[PDB]
């Protein structure tokens, strides 16, 4: 999956909701849940471009009214190879 | 790809128009023609998400004025593994 979808939320409950929605909506792989600090959890998915578009939309919708909310939802269709080095490859 | 696009029409002629259109328009494979009963024929395509969207749009545009009409054009991007058991694998 070339594309990247990312949702940042304030708190983990909103992020889990986002991840769930994203993975259900389209065919995407959750490659990371990242605890940023300060209460930011970023959930990241990879899939083909149309999938990541639908997943992100879905996740965003899901997460907005759960908890403290959504900080950001972003789709990056091809990411520079350099960026790949800072992107999680499987969740841990 | 695993997306599903389904077009239901009233009668078979609209549905063949839809199938034709879908398959020509985007890179999607036709997986079924189902006679639902009551004159509802469902034509189903599987492809990647962008392809499915495009195909279904094209097909609906094609079949709306053909025969008795279009009943539904719908895209489900990732289908639960269970629903797959009720979806035709190849067109037989």
């Amino acid at each position: 999956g070339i594309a990247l979808g990312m949702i940042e939320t304030r708190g983990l409950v909103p992020a889990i909701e986002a991840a769930d929605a994203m993975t259900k909506a389209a065919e995407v792989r959750l490659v990371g849940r990242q605890f940023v600090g300060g209460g930011y959890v970023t959930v990241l998915v990879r899939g083909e471009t149309g999938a990541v578009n639908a997943a992100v939309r879905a996740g965003a919708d899901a997460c907005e009214r759960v908890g403290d909310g959504l900080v950001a939802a972003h789709i990056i269709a091809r990411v520079h190879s350099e960026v790949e080095n800072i992107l999680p490859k499987a969740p841990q | 790809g695993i997306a599903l696009g389904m077009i239901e029409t009233r009668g078979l002629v609209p549905a063949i128009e839809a199938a034709d259109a879908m398959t020509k328009a985007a890179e999607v494979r036709l997986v079924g023609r189902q006679f639902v009963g009551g004159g509802y024929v469902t034509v189903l395509v599987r492809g990647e998400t962008g392809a499915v969207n495009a195909a279904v749009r094209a097909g609906a545009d094609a079949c709306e004025r053909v025969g008795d009409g279009l009943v539904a054009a719908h895209i489900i991007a990732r289908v639960h593994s269970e629903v797959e058991n009720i979806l035709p694998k190849a067109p037989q």
Binding site: A25, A54, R57, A58, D61 | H74, I75, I76, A77
Partner: peptide
Amino acid sequence: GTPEFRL
């Protein structure tokens, strides 16, 4: 089902 709908 789209991202948007969802004689």
